[PDB]
Amino acid sequence: QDKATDLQSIQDEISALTDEIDGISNRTEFNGKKLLDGTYKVDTATPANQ
Amino acid sequence: QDKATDLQSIQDEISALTDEIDGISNRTEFNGKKLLDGTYKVDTATPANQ
């Protein structure tokens, strides 16, 4: 229906939404505790670094 | 009934009508999507280029 220009507009919105997801992951803090970051990954290859 | 001159007049009209058919095929656009052109042929020899 629409061209790579319009798909590029959709990409503008999507990319903004991504940047917000990172923004959530990194601004989210409970008393400074930035949790959503990968620091607290479920199961690293090395269990010591979980 | 009529001569190659008059048949030529009929050809003038017909040729104009042709030129309009191409004009339809190439001016026709939905949000810029020129469809009637052979870009979207039903079944090329190469299915990759359909």
Q: How many helices (H) and strands (E) does chain B have?
A: 1, 2
Q: What is the resolution of this structure in A?
A: 4.4
- Cα B48 to Cα A4, B38, B40, B41, B43: the distances in Å are 20, 14, 11, 11, 9
Helix residue ranges, H only, chain B:
4-27
Token pair 């190469």 in the structure block, residue: B46
Reading the block at residue A5, the tokens are 């220009």
Structure tokens at B41: 């042929």
d(CA B6, CA A46): 92
Contacts of A25 (CB under 8 A, 6+ apart): A36, A37
Measured between beta carbons, the chain B residues lying within 8 angstroms of A1 are 30-31, 33
**Chain A residues near residue B30 by CB distance under 8 angstroms:** 1
Tell me whether residues B32 and A1 touch, CB distance under 8 A.
no
Give A46's DSSP letter: S
Contact residues of A toward B, CB < 8 A:
1-3, 6
Residues in chain B: 50
